[PDB]
Structures are given as C-alpha cells and as structure tokens.
C-alpha cells in the first residue's frame, strides 16, 4: 500500500492538507460545552389547586395523574410533591437517549385522560407540561445602586422589559423571574368596609362592573342599507389604567347623596402579584432571571447572546440600575477547555522531547511529529461527521491519545533507521524494506487499541454517554492514525531522512548523547542476560504471577467507588430551614447573618451573595431559604484552604453556632443537571401503607442512626419539611341561614380578604396586568383578627364571623411527596471527608434495613446513576476482554499468541490499582476508563514483543527461546520509547491542580500508573508466558 505513494508524494501531502483543513473548518463550526446531554430527559407536570391543603391536593389532583401516568415508554422513574399553597409538581425522567420532544407528547397524551377527573379550579388554573431541568445556565440580576426603587420595582421592569425578550432568545428553554410583574392591589380595610356596610364581595362586584373591556359593535356594519356613506366602531368601556382610576372607582351612594368610592375603604397602589419570595444581592434589594438552557442547546452559544442582548437594552435602563452575575458556568466552562488545550500542547511538546532524547536528530524526529497534527485534526473532522461537539470528555479523549497515535510512527522510523545501521541501505530502498516487517504490527496495535474502546459506545445511562465520548475520539485516531502511518510517514522516510554509515551505534559521539547511547546499550545486555536466565527457571516466576494476580484482586475490592469527582466550579449554596411555622421576618435575620459571615469572614474569597428568602430545594415557604455565594476567579484563590471544599467545611462549621435555624453548606454535583447537590440522594419508600406518622417515625429513626456515624456521614438531613401547626375554621351554614347570610358572601369574604383573591386585568403602560383584592397587612395577621370582618345579610345587617363560626388548631404537612406512586420521604447527605459515596451508598443501605417491615428504599437522581454504573461495570470488562481475545486471534487464526498476549493484563491493572489507592482516588466513571485504557495499553506493550518473536520463528526459522531474546533485544528500545511517551503525556494530568483538576487527576493517575507496571512488569513476564503458552502447545 506505501508503494502507491512513494511514486508520487505530493498526493501523500495532498491527502494530510485535506485531513487538516477538515478539522480547521469543524473547529469553526462545532459546538462547545463542558459536558454532552448525558443527563436524562425529564418532564414536569405543573397544576395548582389554589387554597387546598397539602393532604386534600395530593388526594384529588396528584393520585388522579399519577394513576394514569404508568405505562409510558422509557420511563425510569417518577417523583411528585404537593405543598400547601396547593402547588403540585410531578417530575417524570425517562432514560437517556430518549427522545425529550417524543417523551413529551406522551405524557401529555395521557394527562387528557385524567384531565376531566380534576377539579374545575384546576381545569381553570391551567396544567401545564414542560420540560425541565434542575439546573440554571446562568442567573442575570438586577439591582438598584441607590435603593431608590423596591423589590418590585425592579422585578416588574426586568419582566416587562427583560423577561419576554430574554425567554424567547436563541436557545433558552425557561426564564424564572425572582419576583412578580406589577398588579394593581387593593389593600381593603375592614373597620371602614363595617362603617359603610360594605362586603369583599361588593369591591369585586364593583370592580368587575366598572374595569371591563366591550365590545360594540360598528356603525353602518355589514349587511349595510344601500346607499350608506360612513362606517366606524363604537367605543365602549375600556380597562382602567391608573391608581387615581381605581381609586375613584365608585361603590355605593349613601341615603345623603354621598358617593362612597373605593379609595375611601381600601389603599390602591401598584405591587408585587405574590409576596412570598424576596430576594437580596449582599444585602441589597434585588431581582434577578434565572435562566435555563433548552434540552439540545449550546451552553457558551446561548451565553453569548444573552450577554449581547444585555448590553442592547443597557441604554434604556432607569437610573441606579445595574446588572449583576451572581451564577454564570460559562467561565467554568472555558477555563476548563483551555486548560485540557494547555494540556494538549504540553503533551505534544513532551512527546517530542523524549523522542529526541532517542532518535537524536532534528531532521528524522520531526517526521513522526508531523503525523499528530494531521490525525489531531482529522479527529475533529469526525466528531463533526457524526455529529459530536467538543467538550472536556472529547479533550481528554485526544489527550489519552496522544501516546498512543504516535507508537505507529515511532516504530516505523526506528526500523528505517535500524537498516541504516545493520545495512546503510538508502532512505528509499530503506523504507521499502521496512514495511515488509512491520506492516502487521502497525495495524495490529492501532486495531486492537480501538477494538477495546468499541464495547464501551454500546452501553446505556448517563455513564454510557461519558463512554462514547472517549469511544469516538479514541478509536477515530487510532484508525487515523493507522491511515497516515501507512499513507505519510513511508512517502518522508524515503525523501526527508539521510542515510546512516553502516555498523554506526552512536557510541563514539562526545557529547551527552554518546553516554546515553553507550549507558543504554549496556544496560540492554545486561537485561537480555537477565531474561536469558529467566527462561531457564520459568518455574519460579509462575508463582510471582499468582500473587500479583491475587495482589490485584485484594485491591480491587478495597478501593473505595464513587460517581463523578466533585470540581471547584466557582460558587456554591447554602440552605436554611427554620422551625415549622417561622414567618418570613425571621428568616429573613438568619439569612443577613449567613450574608454577613460571608463578606468578613470570607470577604478573601467571596465575590457576591444572592440569597432569597421564602423558597428553597425543600419547597416553597417562609422558613425557608437559599442563597447563592459566588466565589473570584481561581487566579485570586491560591491554595487548598481557598477552595470550595475547604471554604464551606468551615462554613458548615460555623453555622452549627446559630440558634433556631438549620444552615448547610454544600457544592454543587459534578454535573447541576442530575441534582441540586452533591453527595447521595435518598429516597425512602412506605411500600405497605405505614401511614405518614409511621414513616416519619422510621425517618426520624433512620436519621437518628446517621448522626451517630460522623466519621463516614456528614451533612445528613431530610429534604421535607416538618408538620406544621394548621389554622381550622368551621363555618356553621345551619347559623348562617339564621342569620339570613349567603354562603357564597361568606366564602368570598373569607378567601378574598386572608388569601387574596384575582379580579379581573388591567392596562399598565400597554400591558395586561392583574388587578388583586386583598385584606391590610395589619387586619389578616392573628386569629383575633378574624371578629374584625363582618358579612351582610339579607335584610342589611352587618354581622360579625364570630357569630356564625368556631376556630381550632389542628396539624399537617404542608408537603407531601411521592415516589413511583408510593409515598416516600426523601433524605439527603454527603461522605465525610476521606472518605467516597460509594462507602456512604453502602452504609446508608444497611442503616435503612432495620427499619420496621414494609418500609422499602430505593435510589434517585446522582445516587440511582451511581448505583447503575457500578452494576454494569462487570459487564464493560468481561465484554471488552472477549472483544480484545477474537481481536488478536483474527491475526493469526491460532489462539496460543491471543491466550499469552492476555496474560498481561493484570500486570497493567494492578498498576492503576496501586496509583488510585496511593493518592486516595475511588472507582469511579473516569477510572474505570483509566483500566480499559490500561488494558489496551499492556497488550499493546505485549504485541510488540509476541509479534516479532513470532515472526523470527516462522520466517527465519529460529529456536523458540533464541527467537524470543533475540526479538525482546531490538524492542527494547521501542518499549521504553512509547512507554515513556505515554508517562510523560499524561504527566500534565496527573499534576494538574488548577480548575477542573478533579477529572485530570482521575484520569490521568489510572492511566500513568498502570502503564509503569504495564512497562516494568511486562518486559520481564512476557517473554514467560511467551514461552510457556508455545512450550505447551
């Protein structure tokens, strides 16, 4: 096949400038994310039933969907909750892979069916499928410089000028806003509603009648009378526009002529729709979008446009306003990327030092270094083919392969000039005479390399997905790689190289090179004779095997297993849940001294805090709260006390001293999309119908046992809330006919005045608003307040709510959860320090079996991934070594060679075994890569020797053990060479401490560690099992 080129070698360079300008023109256009879509697709079905309890929501809307949601293709797990403002949200995630838009459909296909089975005010309020992640791409707030304008200020300017614009951007799937657009609200007063006999019901009523939009009609409209000359619409009453109109809204004419309008019984002003989120950006009023990326968008893409669009409505903006970033991934994002390209570069660099340190000649190392930047290109080309984007899982990809692309070239110009030195023959006659010897070897190595990388595309899960990254950059450069071996390097070794006085060692030359090349040289003798006495006492060496094999095994099992490596991503959060039943004010002083402690005591490393009071993981409600702390660049955070890991352990710390109030501090998981912290996620299931008393008992049990294991669980906690104390009024309709008052009146008095009722819209500057009707603060807040509210009967009467009602404590949930259909409780938690998830998985699981009977457990979000690629993972090994073992035998028909060549692969295993435990690393996603890498590498460490070996015997005819020292003595050289070009490549990963190092150091480490033993160890073990396996057959 070089024949075809030698001849003519421009159409050798014509073929490598097409591979080149192919990877320049996909870089240009290929997209570019930290991570692929490996998270699962996921849909959420959102309804509310306003005003109902968390008990009666789950009862009528939740079951009524769930109970039709089974039997929906893909599906791999389904969560609800129900809370007491009446909202329900159920969660559905399919597998990975699964079409979302596909996914979507069906899920809406089967809401119809229990569509009609849901309350007319749910029907009314509108149920909505959307899909939805847990994660934001980034959030853009918004604050006032002078605090000249509220909270709600900002937020209706951000949703009337940002939100519309912003949500239908390129790109963006969902913009939560943090706060409310402007509704006209009327803060009603009952003590003047009394003095004029007036009722909720009246306003509303009033309202309604005086705040509408008619229509009319036209003059001389169709079917018109002949001869007609004019025609025009008729204008009736139109949406009022202003506070001053709602104002002078009129409510009745008192017997004297007077005009009681509504401002004389109520406060009209403009504000917030619903109140119970307030947000501050270190401790300043503030708003804010919480943008998300659309399943199949681009993270820096969509960025950039938002950014762009930022700056396009700057020159509108009020005065005081300015944009904040609290949350933005993308500078993640492109640090890590670079970092992986400065990693790159420095691969490449060293690869072609070490060759130099061999080849010693500018001119005959340079050809080999010519072929990675072909073939690096040419891997973009493909991911463009089929349809990949760049991200760190690919730029690792390219990385791991930068020491094996090259053993194809490096061989080659090693024979060449091998023949110069035994025969001088010319570069050309040289390179003919090269391949004739080497051709199976070259495709040999590069197949079976990407045959071991082939199995691992083919597997499912988040941790499939993070396979086939490595698969396609791995085996497209292995085939490349092939390619421009057999298609560049003969056409330069036969024009670019100079000969080589035959009987020429190097060992004569002065300077630093004549030691090297003299040192080598003996020492090569002396392990040739070392290798010679090996052969004849193969007995002994068997039994070192063994224990190896042994060694290897006892390892295995003692390392500790985990997902995906935590990253210093920049910011982190903190949660706080106060008691049951804490009002908004008292959060609100516990989240200014969370804010507080993070701008003194951590003001070295704390950029910003956006904390918002009112909502949280745990579900909406005034205990609770979270905020944002965004962190400097990693340039101004030097050091391992600086680090995200480090800062919120103290944090932690600290925050136990507060009173009152449970404060955590957690990062975030390695991907935001699986979860919303890192650590395991625990679902804790009533499989037989405990009942909510019983199951908590058991969670409370559950966590009980926990807390008395510090040293292996931190940070452990359910993420419900606990029951709180619940306000009961029963109205006696038997008094209420007594009292000639309408139920209706006193079911709108009481609903509009405590929870605020919707009337009708309006027209604010051009936009639709709602109008809100709703009791003083100062008149809604105490039981006592409930005598101040009177109803009037039928005759015109004004008579109190004591008169017809009686009022107790009762308790509740307010949130309920669900999982699969079953109710369940949901608990989460972190490793100590030290130690893995994989132990904390393990212990959580015996914990949760002595729990009574019919309380079951089950995994979700990281942990269920977690669970899932540990059970496969046997299955990833078993299949690859089958695929290696037909791989080799295909070779050669005969499986003796096959069966030697495996006999390697532990001595390469227990390599990365010894390098993870050393450093402390844990089974996880990017070892068990690092060991499928090791694998491949060892055997290809092995091919080198077995396939010269084999050759002299059946070629030249040589004896079995003088064939097998005479082809380990010229492959030495070859080995050291490719085994330190690997060790040298991967270097940079292993001692990577800058961003992202989390992932470099778990690869890098397996890889580099397995290669040494796969280097020492095998360069004494192969020609054993060489010999033995042929000796036997």
């Known amino acids: 096949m070089p024949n075809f080129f030698i001849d003519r070698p421009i159409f050798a360079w014509v073929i490598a400038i097409i591979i080149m300008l192919a990877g320049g023109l996909a870089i240009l256009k290929l997209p570019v994310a930290q991570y692929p879509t490996i998270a699962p697709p996921a849909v959420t079905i959102s309804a509310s039933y306003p005003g109902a309890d968390a008990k009666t929501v789950q009862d009528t809307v939740t079951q009524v969907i769930e109970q039709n949601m089974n039997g929906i293709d893909n599906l ?4 609800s909750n129900s809370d007491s403002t009446g909202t329900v949200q159920i969660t559905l995630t399919f597998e ?41 791409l980034m959030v853009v707030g918004v604050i006032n410089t002078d605090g000249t304008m509220t909270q709600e200020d900002i937020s209706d300017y951000v949703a009337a000028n940002m939100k519309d614009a912003i949500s239908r951007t390129s790109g963006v799937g969902d913009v939560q806003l943090f706060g409310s657009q402007y509704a006209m609200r009327i803060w009603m007063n009952p003590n003047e509603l009394n003095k004029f006999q007036l009722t909720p019901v009246d306003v509303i009523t009033a309202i309604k009648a005086q705040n509408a939009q008619v229509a009319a009609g036209q003059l001389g409209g169709t079917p018109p009378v002949k001869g007609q000359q004019l025609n025009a619409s008729i204008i009736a009453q139109t949406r009022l526009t202003s506070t001053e109109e709602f104002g002078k809204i009129l409510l009745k004419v008192n017997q004297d002529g007077s005009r009681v309008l509504l401002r004389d019984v109520a406060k009209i002003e403009l504000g917030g729709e619903n109140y119970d989120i307030i947000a501050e950006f270190n401790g300043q009023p503030a708003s804010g979008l919480g943008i998300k990326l659309a399943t ?25 306003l300015k944009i904040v970033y609290p949350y933005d991934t993308t500078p993640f994002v492109k640090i890590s990327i670079h970092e992986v390209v400065k990693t790159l570069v420095e691969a490449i660099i060293l690869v072609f030092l070490v060759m130099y340190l061999f080849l010693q000649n500018f001119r005959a190392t340079l050809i080999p270094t010519i072929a990675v930047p072909v073939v690096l290109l040419g891997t973009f080309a493909v991911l463009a083919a089929f349809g990949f984007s760049i991200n760190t899982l690919t730029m690792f990809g390219m990385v791991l392969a930068i020491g094996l692309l090259v053993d194809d070239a490096i061989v080659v110009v090693e024979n060449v000039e091998r023949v110069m030195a035994e025969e001088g023959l010319p570069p050309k006659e040289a390179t003919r005479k090269s ?53 560049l390097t003969p056409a330069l070794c036969a024009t670019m190289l100079k000969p080589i006085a035959k009987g020429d060692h190097g060992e004569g030359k002065k300077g630093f090179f004549g030691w090297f090349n003299r040192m080598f040289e003996k020492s090569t003798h002396h392990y040739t004779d070392s290798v010679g006495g090996i052969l004849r006492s193969t007995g002994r060496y068997l039994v070192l095997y063994l224990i190896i094999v042994v060694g290897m095994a006892y390892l295995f099992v003692r390392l500790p297993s985990s997902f995906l490596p935590d990253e210093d991503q920049g910011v982190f959060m903190t949660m706080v849940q106060l008691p049951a039943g804490a009002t908004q004010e008292r959060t609100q002083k516990v989240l200014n001294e969370v804010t507080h402690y993070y701008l003194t005591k951590e003001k070295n490393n704390v950029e910003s805090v956006f904390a918002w009071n009112g909502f949280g993981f745990a579900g909406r409600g005034q205990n609770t709260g979270i905020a944002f702390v965004s962190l400097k660049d990693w340039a101004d955070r030097p050091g391992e006390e600086n680090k995200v890991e480090a800062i919120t352990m103290r944090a932690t710390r600290a925050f136990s001293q ?29 499989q037989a119908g405990l009942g909510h008393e019983k199951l908590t008992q058991a969670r409370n049990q559950l966590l009980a046992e926990a807390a008395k294991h510090p040293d292996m669980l931190t940070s452990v ?49 051009g936009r639709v608003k709602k109008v809100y009707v709703m009791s003083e603060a100062k008149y809604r807040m105490l039981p006592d307040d409930i005598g101040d509210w009177y109803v009037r009967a039928a005759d015109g009467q004004m008579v109190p709510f004591s008169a017809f009602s009686s009022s107790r404590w009762e308790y509740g949930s307010p949130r309920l959860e669900r999982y699969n259909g079953l109710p369940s409780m949901e608990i989460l938690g972190q490793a100590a320090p030290g130690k893995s998830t994989g132990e904390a998985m393990e212990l959580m699981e015996q914990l949760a079996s002595k729990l009574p009977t019919g309380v079951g457990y089950d995994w979700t979000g990281m942990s269920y991934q ?33 069966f030697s060549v495996m006999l390697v692969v532990p001595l390469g295993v227990i390599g990365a075994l010894l390098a993870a435990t050393f450093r402390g690393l844990t089974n996880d996603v990017y070892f068990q890569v690092g060991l499928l890498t090791t694998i491949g590498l060892s055997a290809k460490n092995a091919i080198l020797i077995v396939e010269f070996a084999k050759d002299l015997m059946d070629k030249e005819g040589k004896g079995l053990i003088e064939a097998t020292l005479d082809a380990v003595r010229m492959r030495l050289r070859p080995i050291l060479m490719t085994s330190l070009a690997f060790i040298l490549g991967v270097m940079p990963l292993v001692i990577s401490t800058g961003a992202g190092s989390g992932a470099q150091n778990a690869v890098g480490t397996g890889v580099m560690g397995g290669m040494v033993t796969a280097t020492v160890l095998a360069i004494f073990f192969v020609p054993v099992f060489f010999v033995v396996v042929r000796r036997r057959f």
């Open 76 to 79: 791999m797990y389904m969560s």
């Open 96 to 136: 990975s892979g699964t079409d979302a838009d596909i996914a979507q459909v069906q899920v809406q296909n089967k809401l119809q069916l229990a569509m009609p089975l849901l309350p007319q005010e749910v029907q009314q309020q509108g149920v909505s499928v959307e899909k939805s992640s847990s994660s934001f």
């Open 296 to 320: 199949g968008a681009n993270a820096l893409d969509t960025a950039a446009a938002i950014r762009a669009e930022l700056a396009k409505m700057e020159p509108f903006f009020p005065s005081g």
């Open 435 to 487: 391949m004739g010897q080497i051709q199976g070897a070259l495709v040999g190595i590069a197949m079976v390399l990407s045959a071991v990388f082939v199995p691992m595309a083919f597997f499912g899960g988040s941790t499939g997905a993070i396979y086939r990254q490595f698969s396609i950059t791995i085996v497209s450069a292995m085939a490349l790689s092939v390619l421009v071996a057999l298609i």
């Open 658 to 686: 507060i009173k009152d109030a449970m404060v955590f501090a957690f990062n975030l998981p390695a991907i935001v999309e699986l979860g919303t912290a890192t650590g395991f996620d625990f679902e804790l299931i009533d």
């Open 717 to 765: 906690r359910p993420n419900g809330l606990e029951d709180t104390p619940q306000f009961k009024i029963d109205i006696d309709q038997e008094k209420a006919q007594a009292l000639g008052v309408s139920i209706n009146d006193i079911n709108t008095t009481l609903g509009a005045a405590w929870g605020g009722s919707y009337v009708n819209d309006f027209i604010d500057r």
């Open 866 to 898: 977690e669970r899932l690629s540990g059970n496969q993972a046997p299955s990833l090994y078993a299949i690859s070594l089958i695929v290696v073992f037909l791989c080799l035998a295909a070779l050669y028909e005969s499986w003796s060679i096959p």
